[PDB]
């Protein structure tokens, strides 16, 4: 029962999800696409001669930048009614991420479609950028046109590229950005709403670890990387969201909240799904998120495999192409970049984040072990303060052979909260440092976090979610592979006043091959 986008030009409604303040929304909620009386045709693979090479936004040639600027300028010049227009392209994101469509074609007209918070996250945005990229190319007669990508997994590429800065005369410019972050400032891939008073050196090191954390530590298998299973009939109210992937809830979300203008009602443009598409950097951010998918597989680590579930493969969306034709595309058809005739320009060397595993904790920095166990704790627990609890592990002292067959994964389920605002809390495991020990935002005890852009549903006031954290490296890094219990510490960062956690448990997840 795969999620199937309906006739988007026939069945559509104004965005009513993930927008905390609709009264005063600076951008429109009328995200329905133009009706040009076109029939939805099946997708056909491109016959391009050369492969479109996407370039780092901070290492672009004069031609690459000018072509990109001229292309956006052309897109901004089109009428709003045009499917290829700047406004229309932005509305695509709004329609799919803020309840524009329903699962009516699958027989559930009372259930909205949400590409986010699911395994549809990566493939959707790949198709999104795919048509977006080919549209820009055709508007300037560049058959070999290629988008840039925000290479924030590389130090010199972490600050916003200056090509997006300046003033309104620049097509790539957007006034609706965080003023405190547009001054050549380094991005925080683990942003929680408040700037950190740490050196640039520390921030880069933590950014590199965040990439490693999202692609290696927590991206241990397809479920934890792409996101949870999401089939037709699935409602966010009955019951909750498909667990969110490591990238989506991690570095991806961080950039959205870091770029978005906090002075605006819904943190427009980037800070919210419904308005993100109005900022040119949005597509360039997702160009690298799209690249994380590529890198995640090129690591060729165990468990880093493609999805084979037919419910994923047969899931489909609808887009307008450069010829204003309605095209239905399937997830199965975007797994191969060679077939889509594009790729990314890499440094010919080793990725700077490849070895950004947190440093081993010294036993001399740790003390011996009073925290209650799950059996002693009354759930659900509310995270309006730091919460500590000991969780029984599924095993202890696993051999190297055992760890290569299954991941020890911490599962935090039934996370209920008002999704009208941005939510984030951090997760630390086996924290037992002595007093006076120096700490960093990228310590080994840090398992990562659960961050959520507002995506509150139309007919519920509360959304439910799930997070997955890999412990194979962490337990080693903390010298606690032998301990029967794992002390899990949940630290709220923002929007956790009403947040509650329903269940916490550690399980062995077999590595798929
Ligand atoms: Cu999105
Ligand atoms: Cu995004």
XYZ file of C-alpha atoms and ligand atoms in Angstrom:
515
model
C 0.000 0.000 0.000
C 2.444 2.671 -1.231
C 1.868 6.395 -0.717
C 0.547 7.779 -3.994
C 0.258 11.451 -4.887
C -3.166 12.173 -6.410
C -4.010 14.350 -9.402
C -2.351 17.398 -7.839
C -4.108 19.766 -10.271
C -7.512 18.275 -9.416
C -7.348 17.267 -5.745
C -5.612 19.868 -3.577
C -6.241 22.185 -0.620
C -4.543 25.135 1.078
C -1.688 24.267 3.438
C -2.980 23.757 6.987
C -0.123 21.807 8.594
C 3.202 22.785 10.134
C 2.373 26.496 10.291
C 2.094 27.706 13.876
C 0.991 31.219 12.964
C -1.167 31.255 9.842
C -2.562 34.643 10.841
C 0.299 36.800 9.564
C 2.137 34.233 7.455
C 4.266 36.385 5.151
C 4.113 33.785 2.349
C 0.973 32.214 0.876
C -0.736 29.008 2.007
C -2.347 28.603 -1.424
C 0.255 26.092 -2.601
C -1.882 24.218 -5.144
C -0.250 23.833 -8.582
C -1.476 25.441 -11.841
C -4.167 23.607 -13.821
C -3.140 23.728 -17.490
C -5.368 20.796 -18.460
C -2.404 18.445 -18.847
C -2.659 14.656 -18.528
C -0.303 12.988 -16.044
C 2.292 11.132 -18.114
C 4.674 8.447 -16.864
C 8.297 9.464 -16.348
C 10.918 8.732 -19.003
C 14.647 8.689 -18.271
C 16.789 11.527 -19.712
C 18.883 10.988 -22.848
C 21.519 13.545 -21.831
C 24.922 13.157 -23.490
C 27.014 14.520 -20.615
C 26.457 14.152 -16.867
C 25.406 17.301 -15.003
C 28.175 18.068 -12.503
C 26.931 19.878 -9.400
C 29.551 22.173 -7.870
C 30.512 23.397 -4.375
C 28.896 26.794 -3.745
C 32.196 28.069 -2.318
C 34.414 26.815 -5.162
C 32.441 27.717 -8.277
C 33.848 29.038 -11.541
C 32.790 32.405 -12.962
C 30.681 30.568 -15.541
C 28.989 28.270 -13.026
C 27.951 31.134 -10.755
C 26.831 33.438 -13.579
C 24.778 30.684 -15.210
C 23.117 29.946 -11.867
C 22.408 33.630 -11.179
C 21.044 34.145 -14.689
C 18.852 31.052 -14.301
C 17.268 32.123 -11.003
C 16.827 35.603 -12.477
C 14.949 34.004 -15.373
C 12.823 31.956 -12.979
C 11.944 35.026 -10.899
C 10.875 36.795 -14.097
C 8.199 34.238 -15.015
C 4.502 34.734 -14.174
C 3.347 33.169 -10.892
C 0.841 31.094 -12.867
C 3.750 29.404 -14.660
C 4.701 26.009 -13.181
C 8.389 26.846 -13.734
C 8.206 30.151 -11.857
C 10.087 30.975 -8.664
C 6.807 31.093 -6.744
C 5.406 27.888 -8.252
C 8.569 25.930 -7.486
C 8.531 27.134 -3.876
C 4.870 26.142 -3.561
C 5.780 22.549 -4.451
C 7.527 22.188 -1.102
C 4.573 23.786 0.681
C 2.000 21.503 -0.955
C 3.837 18.283 -0.058
C 5.135 19.229 3.405
C 2.138 21.147 4.785
C -0.820 18.941 3.906
C -1.664 20.086 0.397
C -2.549 16.576 -0.774
C -4.318 13.562 0.741
C -4.042 9.782 0.432
C -7.295 9.784 -1.556
C -5.889 7.690 -4.410
C -4.979 5.017 -1.850
C -8.510 5.191 -0.434
C -7.909 7.567 2.479
C -9.174 11.072 1.603
C -9.232 12.119 5.276
C -5.486 11.528 5.707
C -2.935 14.095 4.531
C 0.304 13.237 2.740
C 3.575 14.067 4.485
C 6.814 13.306 2.647
C 8.825 14.446 5.666
C 9.292 12.333 8.802
C 9.499 9.208 6.645
C 11.577 7.159 4.219
C 10.073 9.323 1.452
C 12.248 12.229 2.637
C 15.346 11.559 0.526
C 13.739 10.337 -2.730
C 11.154 13.146 -2.811
C 13.661 15.981 -2.548
C 15.868 14.268 -5.126
C 13.001 14.375 -7.621
C 12.134 17.858 -6.393
C 15.616 19.129 -7.233
C 15.789 16.992 -10.372
C 12.983 18.830 -12.180
C 13.897 22.138 -10.530
C 17.432 21.748 -11.872
C 16.353 20.868 -15.424
C 13.868 23.747 -15.463
C 16.560 26.302 -14.606
C 18.782 24.802 -17.291
C 16.160 25.152 -20.015
C 15.337 28.754 -19.072
C 18.877 29.827 -20.020
C 19.499 27.340 -22.845
C 22.086 25.406 -20.819
C 21.631 21.677 -21.488
C 24.542 20.888 -19.152
C 23.292 23.137 -16.343
C 24.003 21.974 -12.796
C 22.918 23.306 -9.407
C 25.500 24.190 -6.785
C 25.450 22.403 -3.423
C 26.109 23.781 0.050
C 29.097 21.683 1.108
C 28.740 22.241 4.856
C 30.462 18.891 5.393
C 33.664 20.759 4.478
C 35.173 23.607 6.610
C 35.583 26.290 3.918
C 32.074 25.509 2.658
C 30.362 25.708 6.055
C 29.630 29.446 6.028
C 26.907 30.631 3.642
C 28.584 31.148 0.274
C 28.840 34.846 -0.568
C 27.018 34.213 -3.857
C 23.745 34.246 -1.898
C 24.641 37.438 -0.023
C 24.566 41.135 -0.936
C 21.288 42.896 -1.713
C 18.002 42.547 -3.609
C 19.733 43.088 -6.965
C 21.223 39.613 -6.463
C 18.770 36.906 -7.626
C 20.184 34.501 -5.033
C 19.568 36.970 -2.197
C 16.808 36.715 0.406
C 16.091 39.337 3.065
C 14.300 36.770 5.227
C 17.354 35.168 6.808
C 18.810 35.254 10.328
C 20.760 38.523 10.397
C 23.103 37.135 13.058
C 24.127 34.315 10.702
C 24.541 36.029 7.321
C 27.799 37.772 8.265
C 30.104 35.059 6.897
C 29.322 33.044 10.041
C 29.943 29.301 10.292
C 26.825 27.131 10.193
C 25.840 25.117 13.270
C 24.818 21.665 12.052
C 23.562 20.967 15.585
C 21.710 24.263 16.064
C 19.057 24.371 18.806
C 17.741 27.915 18.359
C 20.465 29.660 20.356
C 23.951 30.534 19.128
C 26.855 28.840 20.908
C 29.659 30.961 22.357
C 32.397 28.618 21.125
C 35.435 29.261 18.886
C 35.212 28.762 15.118
C 37.713 25.923 15.492
C 35.393 24.082 17.884
C 32.342 24.654 15.674
C 34.018 23.176 12.590
C 35.187 20.146 14.572
C 31.661 19.658 15.898
C 30.170 20.098 12.432
C 32.467 17.381 11.079
C 31.463 15.066 13.937
C 27.802 15.823 13.239
C 28.257 14.593 9.668
C 29.989 11.472 10.969
C 27.246 11.071 13.563
C 24.450 11.284 10.984
C 26.106 9.060 8.366
C 27.916 6.505 10.555
C 26.980 6.447 14.255
C 23.221 6.869 13.798
C 22.892 6.082 10.089
C 23.606 2.415 10.785
C 20.853 0.925 8.610
C 18.241 2.038 6.036
C 15.568 2.581 8.704
C 17.758 4.894 10.782
C 19.150 6.766 7.772
C 16.231 7.184 5.354
C 13.524 7.180 8.024
C 10.729 4.901 9.202
C 8.280 2.924 7.085
C 5.384 5.000 5.747
C 2.588 3.320 3.792
C -0.925 4.291 2.727
C -3.371 4.444 5.626
C -0.738 5.776 8.015
C -2.055 8.761 9.965
C -0.003 11.031 12.236
C -2.878 10.749 14.719
C -3.297 6.970 14.367
C -0.685 6.626 15.546
C 2.255 9.018 15.305
C 5.028 9.591 12.793
C 7.342 7.092 11.073
C 10.635 7.408 13.007
C 12.744 10.200 11.519
C 16.108 9.621 9.857
C 19.462 10.699 11.255
C 20.103 13.304 8.564
C 16.576 14.750 8.439
C 16.305 15.263 12.200
C 19.980 16.202 12.449
C 22.109 18.412 10.223
C 19.251 18.952 7.764
C 16.919 20.463 10.362
C 19.754 22.470 11.904
C 20.428 24.384 8.688
C 16.735 25.233 8.266
C 16.504 26.825 11.714
C 19.944 28.432 11.414
C 19.172 30.244 8.137
C 15.521 31.146 8.740
C 14.845 34.677 9.980
C 13.803 34.317 13.629
C 12.162 37.775 13.580
C 9.533 36.527 11.124
C 6.224 34.928 12.275
C 7.086 31.360 11.226
C 10.853 31.857 11.016
C 10.494 32.459 7.269
C 11.774 31.581 4.834
C 13.994 28.577 5.637
C 12.748 28.068 9.195
C 9.498 26.499 7.984
C 8.508 23.973 5.309
C 5.800 26.145 3.759
C 8.166 29.036 3.019
C 11.573 27.366 2.613
C 11.310 27.240 -1.177
C 11.294 31.040 -1.426
C 14.947 31.107 -0.368
C 17.283 30.061 -3.222
C 19.686 28.516 -0.687
C 17.000 25.965 0.227
C 17.549 24.013 -2.987
C 21.318 24.316 -2.598
C 21.078 23.012 0.964
C 19.063 20.009 -0.232
C 21.561 19.494 -3.043
C 24.040 18.457 -0.347
C 21.422 16.499 1.608
C 20.873 14.679 -1.671
C 24.638 14.150 -1.728
C 24.577 12.680 1.799
C 22.526 9.848 0.306
C 25.303 9.264 -2.227
C 28.055 9.466 0.394
C 26.147 7.223 2.801
C 26.322 4.428 0.222
C 29.838 5.177 -1.022
C 31.048 4.536 2.527
C 30.247 0.904 1.725
C 29.933 0.123 5.430
C 27.752 -2.783 6.595
C 24.054 -1.898 6.603
C 24.510 0.929 4.107
C 22.194 -0.599 1.506
C 19.272 0.557 -0.630
C 15.612 0.056 0.240
C 13.955 -2.939 -1.429
C 10.493 -2.621 0.127
C 7.917 -2.493 -2.712
C 5.859 0.009 -0.687
C 8.823 2.380 -0.949
C 9.774 1.563 -4.534
C 6.213 2.065 -5.785
C 5.612 5.310 -3.899
C 5.177 8.196 -6.326
C 4.828 11.960 -6.646
C 3.807 14.326 -9.451
C 5.857 17.208 -10.863
C 5.852 19.665 -13.744
C 8.924 19.352 -15.973
C 10.672 21.920 -18.177
C 8.027 21.301 -20.855
C 5.170 22.099 -18.449
C 4.124 18.430 -18.612
C 2.746 16.625 -15.564
C 5.046 13.711 -14.783
C 4.559 10.928 -12.245
C 7.834 9.675 -10.774
C 8.610 6.673 -8.557
C 11.223 6.227 -5.816
C 12.574 3.153 -7.589
C 13.712 5.307 -10.512
C 15.876 7.849 -8.633
C 18.261 5.514 -6.795
C 20.803 5.663 -9.642
C 22.410 9.059 -10.251
C 23.883 7.905 -13.567
C 20.387 7.330 -14.952
C 19.266 10.778 -13.776
C 22.359 12.100 -15.567
C 23.914 14.170 -12.787
C 26.443 13.947 -9.965
C 28.642 15.985 -7.612
C 32.169 17.346 -8.040
C 34.290 15.818 -5.274
C 37.847 16.596 -4.177
C 40.197 14.173 -5.929
C 40.848 13.740 -1.200
C 39.692 11.871 1.909
C 36.538 13.409 3.365
C 37.321 15.643 6.364
C 34.460 14.060 8.340
C 35.351 10.425 7.617
C 37.398 10.135 10.814
C 35.448 12.576 12.983
C 34.429 9.897 15.460
C 34.338 11.374 18.973
C 37.614 10.865 20.864
C 37.848 7.914 23.261
C 36.898 8.868 26.817
C 39.718 8.343 29.310
C 38.819 6.152 32.289
C 40.751 8.640 34.423
C 38.092 11.206 33.497
C 35.235 8.956 34.636
C 33.884 8.079 38.085
C 32.190 4.908 39.340
C 28.452 5.008 38.547
C 21.939 6.729 41.906
C 19.530 6.716 38.953
C 16.171 4.943 38.745
C 15.518 2.189 36.200
C 12.629 1.994 33.732
C 10.817 -0.396 36.074
C 11.100 2.259 38.791
C 9.903 5.070 36.506
C 6.295 6.035 35.782
C 5.772 6.665 32.066
C 5.043 8.782 30.175
C 7.614 11.238 31.543
C 7.602 14.943 30.666
C 10.849 16.499 29.440
C 10.404 19.960 30.977
C 13.726 19.329 32.730
C 16.746 17.023 32.487
C 15.603 13.402 32.695
C 17.895 10.505 33.655
C 17.059 6.788 33.630
C 18.915 3.463 33.496
C 17.895 1.184 30.616
C 18.509 -2.573 30.569
C 20.714 -3.572 27.638
C 19.957 -6.624 25.441
C 23.508 -7.930 25.923
C 26.966 -7.187 27.329
C 30.585 -7.692 26.258
C 29.694 -8.451 22.637
C 32.603 -9.658 20.497
C 33.785 -7.868 17.358
C 31.961 -10.550 15.369
C 28.699 -9.913 17.229
C 28.867 -6.144 16.673
C 29.293 -6.698 12.930
C 26.019 -8.655 12.812
C 23.722 -6.363 14.795
C 23.572 -2.766 16.020
C 22.706 -2.002 19.633
C 20.122 0.738 19.121
C 18.553 3.051 21.699
C 14.876 3.590 20.858
C 12.975 6.585 22.223
C 9.352 6.012 21.212
C 6.017 7.762 21.800
C 7.535 11.245 21.858
C 4.414 13.405 22.216
C 4.565 17.183 21.806
C 2.857 20.252 20.363
C 4.353 20.518 16.882
C 3.265 24.139 16.506
C 6.805 25.213 17.390
C 10.349 23.962 16.811
C 11.290 21.153 19.203
C 14.688 19.759 20.161
C 16.270 17.789 22.993
C 19.700 16.170 23.299
C 20.482 12.563 24.223
C 23.557 11.594 26.249
C 24.432 7.984 27.113
C 26.609 6.770 29.987
C 27.654 10.232 31.105
C 29.811 9.782 34.196
C 32.497 12.455 33.952
C 34.286 13.763 37.035
C 33.742 17.329 38.226
C 35.951 19.840 36.427
C 36.399 17.702 33.320
C 36.387 19.785 30.141
C 33.357 19.158 27.931
C 32.617 19.869 24.273
C 29.469 19.879 22.116
C 30.941 16.803 20.387
C 31.804 14.512 23.309
C 31.552 10.702 22.948
C 28.676 10.541 25.449
C 26.552 12.555 23.014
C 24.384 10.171 20.980
C 22.789 13.008 19.006
C 19.373 14.632 19.197
C 15.765 14.710 18.054
C 14.922 17.952 16.251
C 11.576 18.685 14.607
C 10.489 21.504 12.311
C 6.826 22.397 12.923
C 4.613 19.861 11.138
C 1.545 19.800 13.394
C -1.416 18.152 11.690
C -4.705 19.859 10.857
C -6.933 17.759 13.131
C -4.601 16.959 16.031
C -2.897 19.402 18.410
C -0.163 16.880 19.263
C 2.264 14.909 17.095
C 4.034 11.664 18.067
C 7.518 10.667 16.884
C 10.373 8.188 17.316
C 14.173 8.432 17.404
C 16.889 5.811 16.853
C 20.489 6.054 18.093
C 23.327 3.606 17.435
C 25.380 2.578 20.473
C 28.024 0.268 18.964
C 30.714 2.970 18.995
C 29.360 5.004 21.906
C 29.575 2.176 24.448
C 33.195 1.616 23.444
C 33.896 5.357 23.524
C 32.520 5.510 27.078
C 34.132 2.283 28.344
C 30.734 0.814 29.264
C 30.522 -2.223 26.973
C 30.549 -4.430 30.079
C 27.817 -2.684 32.072
C 24.361 -4.276 32.148
C 22.549 -0.928 32.343
C 22.974 2.143 30.145
C 22.280 5.519 31.760
C 20.318 7.621 29.261
C 20.184 11.377 29.875
C 17.636 13.475 27.978
C 18.350 17.221 27.939
C 15.613 19.522 26.593
C 16.804 22.448 24.438
C 13.695 24.172 23.100
C 9.955 23.576 22.817
C 10.100 20.766 25.386
C 7.785 22.406 27.937
C 4.916 20.146 26.850
C 7.026 17.311 25.445
C 6.693 13.827 26.929
C 8.394 10.482 26.294
C 6.297 7.320 26.405
C 8.887 4.555 26.106
C 12.651 3.982 26.200
C 14.420 0.726 25.348
C 17.609 -0.713 23.859
C 17.424 -3.434 21.211
C 19.753 -5.395 18.943
C 18.956 -4.562 15.320
C 20.336 -7.069 12.789
C 22.349 -5.378 10.039
C 20.645 -5.875 6.651
C 22.808 -7.058 3.742
Cu 11.319 19.282 2.515
Cu 14.694 20.693 4.088
